[PDB]
């Protein structure tokens, strides 16, 4: 009955602490003011968007790899190996209908994460780790990111 909107500007390489955590029912949307589908190779990730728990766990890791022409979704506890990674083939195909900008949305359905690029749902991710999101990061491979140097993030919390 009293939802909230929080806006963040995330510079590449940075991690921001959410003024309000993202839990079941809440939403996170990343806005990119540019799209470079022919930027270069990632080491191996050109661009990575992360949702992190209060103790460093990678609730959700989203990685775009041009050289491999794929998108990877994984998770992992702090100082622990990477877990079972789901992948979606064809990067450009997902950004069809972009036009110099893109938005990635993540719905926290509680027991899963729905990832949408623009208007297309790309995957229904099954949570390998549970918990509320308290911080988000935008990591890039030097000079080869498919997104703008600064990505805007909007969270809609306190829905359910």
Ligand X SMILES: OC[C@H]1O[C@@H](O[C@H]2[C@H](O)[C@@H](O)[C@H](O)O[C@@H]2CO)[C@H](O)[C@@H](O)[C@H]1O
- List contacts with ligand X (CB under 6 A): 44-45, 61, 63, 72, 74, 82, 85
- Binding to a second copy (CB under 8 A): which residues in 27-46? 27, 29
Among residues 11, 40, 38, 16, which one has the least CA distance to residue 28? 16
Please state the φ and ψ torsions of residue 32, each to the nearest 5 degrees. -120, 130
Number of residues near a second copy (by CB under 8 A)? 25
For ligand X, the closer of residues 24 and 139 by Cβ is 139
Applying CB under 8 A, which of residues 121, 126, 130, 143 lies at the interface with a second copy?
121
Provide the token pair at 45. 């990730």
- Per partner kind, with CB cut-offs from 5 to 8 A, the member of ligand X, a second copy, none near residue 64 is none
Task: Please report how close the Cβ of residue 139 comes to ligand X at its closest, in angstroms.
Answer: 8
Q: Is 116 in the site for a second copy (CB under 8 A)?
A: yes
Residues that bind a second copy (CB under 8 A): 1-7, 25, 27, 29, 103, 105, 107, 109, 112, 114, 116, 118-119, 121, 124, 154, 156, 159-160
């Amino acid at each position: 009955t009293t939802s909230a909107v929080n806006i963040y500007n995330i510079s590449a390489g940075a991690s921001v602490d959410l003024a309000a955590p993202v839990t079941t029912g809440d939403i996170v949307t990343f806005f990119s003011s540019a799209l470079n589908l022919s930027a270069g190779a990632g080491s191996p990730n050109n661009t990575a968007l992360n949702l992190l728990s209060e103790n460093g766990a990678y609730l959700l890791h989203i990685a775009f790899r041009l050289q491999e022409n794929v998108i990877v979704f994984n998770s992992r506890q702090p100082n622990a190996p990477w877990l079972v990674e789901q992948r979606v083939s064809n990067v450009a195909n997902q950004f069809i209908g972009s036009g110099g900008k893109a938005m990635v949305t993540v719905f926290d359905h509680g027991d899963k994460y729905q990832v949408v690029i623009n208007e297309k749902t790309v995957i229904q991710y099954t949570k390998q780790i549970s918990g509320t999101t308290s911080s988000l990061s935008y990591n890039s491979t030097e000079g080869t990111s498919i997104f703008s140097t600064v990505v805007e993030a909007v969270t809609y919390t306190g829905l359910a």
